Design a protein around this ligand. Structure first.
Ligand SMILES: O=C(c1ccc(F)cc1)C1CCN(CCn2c(=O)[nH]c3ccccc3c2=O)CC1
Length: 384
């Protein structure tokens, strides 16, 4: 009965991404009103992703000393605290602190949950399936966040989305306490291989780079696309919001189905095809003239990112099992660092490049990089 661990990881990722995507619509207007009585949003997101990026190696090393359950419960506690502060804080410094705490909790939950899933599902196929489900939960939380927040804001109040999220967080924490039971400290049997040896592995580097570039695609998509839309198509705000819906839906479907299909098609082949597809979709994005012209490339981008994630995340554990000690804190900390590497420079830089050179040139460069990195996944195939 280890499906409870999968449910806990699923819930943690879902609620974390739900908070990360639900805070967005409300705070900036209140910040502007407070200042009186676009860029700072990207600064908030960069802060959260950067704090998650810094914490990842530390949590990876910590999971080898105190085990997984205590980091998971700590992630839950920090995530609850950040949700409460989001509910009650109205200034900018407190909201920045809330974002940083949410980043720490994101690092804890993601790294420890992936490590626990890898350590529990030792089969190479079941591992792929369960982390495909976990990434599908991440995508589900991303997709549900904004509609849930808008509905609760219109129905009850501004604090309602965060209070309901905090109630769900308390339910998840009660489940964790009942199942995980982080009463004592349980060190792992074998000392983990240091990251200095892990970053020296070309295959782990290749998988991490594939994840990093695949996520960098959408990471620089998010803040630069609305400006280009308003400049060329003069599109409306609802059209801007709808634009990323195909990406989220395709990401959810891709994660859920390719967590299973990667082991059938071949993880290396799935990653190569995903990189090619995301490169082609990003190349085709600038040529669109209407939102209907971006419905298909966004779907391709989401599907390809789901392919790459749900293929490379299992391959990380497979590689660390094959050529390293069977401990998954450090390698999945590396994978989280790969995620945050794109998600942290996205908001901060994407605008800068989209202003220095044209948005079509930026997206052409990103797509060319992804296409050229696609053949590097050829080296991740198994000899037998
Ligand atoms: O949509 C997504 C997605 C994922 C995979 C996939 F394949 C297809 C789509 C998710 C949606 C949440 N974001 C992170 C949240 N976030 C920022 O981090 N920075 C921003 C800067 C400016 C404006 C908004 C944002 C913003 O929402 C991460 C990716």
């Amino acid at each position: 009965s280890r499906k409870l661990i999968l449910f806990i990881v699923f819930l943690a990722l879902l609620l974390d991404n739900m908070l990360l995507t639900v805070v967005v619509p409300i705070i900036p207007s209140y910040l502007y009103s407070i200042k009186h009585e676009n860029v700072q949003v990207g600064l908030l997101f960069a802060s959260k992703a950067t704090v998650q990026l810094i914490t990842n190696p530390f949590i990876g090393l910590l999971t080898n000393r105190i085990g997984y359950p205590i980091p998971i419960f700590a992630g839950f506690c920090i995530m609850f605290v950040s949700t409460i502060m989001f509910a009650f804080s109205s200034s900018y410094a407190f909201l920045l602190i809330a974002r940083s705490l949410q980043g720490i909790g994101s690092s804890c939950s993601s790294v420890a949950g992936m490590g626990m899933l890898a350590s529990v599902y030792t089969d190479d196929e079941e591992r792929g399936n369960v982390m495909g489900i976990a990434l599908g939960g991440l995508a589900m939380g991303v997709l549900v966040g904004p509609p849930f927040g808008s509905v609760l804001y219109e129905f009850v109040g501004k604090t309602a989305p965060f209070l309901v999220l905090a109630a769900l967080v308390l339910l998840d924490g009660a489940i964790q306490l009942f199942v995980l039971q982080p009463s004592r400290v349980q060190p792992e049997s074998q000392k983990g291989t240091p990251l200095t040896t892990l970053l020296k592995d070309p295959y782990i580097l290749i998988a991490a780079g594939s994840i990093c570039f695949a996520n960098m695609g959408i990471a620089m998509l998010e803040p630069a696309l609305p400006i280009w839309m308003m400049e060329t198509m003069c599109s409306r705000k609802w059209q801007l919001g709808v634009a990323f819906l195909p990406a989220s839906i395709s990401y959810l479907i891709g994660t859920n189905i390719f967590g299973i299909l990667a082991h059938k098609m071949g993880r290396w082949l799935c990653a190569l095809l995903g990189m090619i597809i995301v490169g082609v979709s990003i190349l085709c994005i600038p040529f669109a003239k209407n939102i209907y012209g971006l419905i298909a490339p966004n779907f391709g981008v989401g599907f390809a990112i789901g392919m790459v994630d749900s293929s490379m995340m299992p391959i990380m554990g497979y590689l660390v099992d094959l050529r390293h000690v069977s401990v998954y804190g450090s390698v999945y900390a590396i994978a989280d660092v790969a995620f945050c590497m794109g998600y942290a420079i996205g908001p901060s830089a994407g605008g800068a490049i989209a202003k220095a050179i044209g948005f079509p040139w930026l997206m052409t460069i990103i797509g060319i990089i992804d296409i050229l990195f696609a053949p590097l996944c050829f080296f991740l195939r198994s000899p037998p």
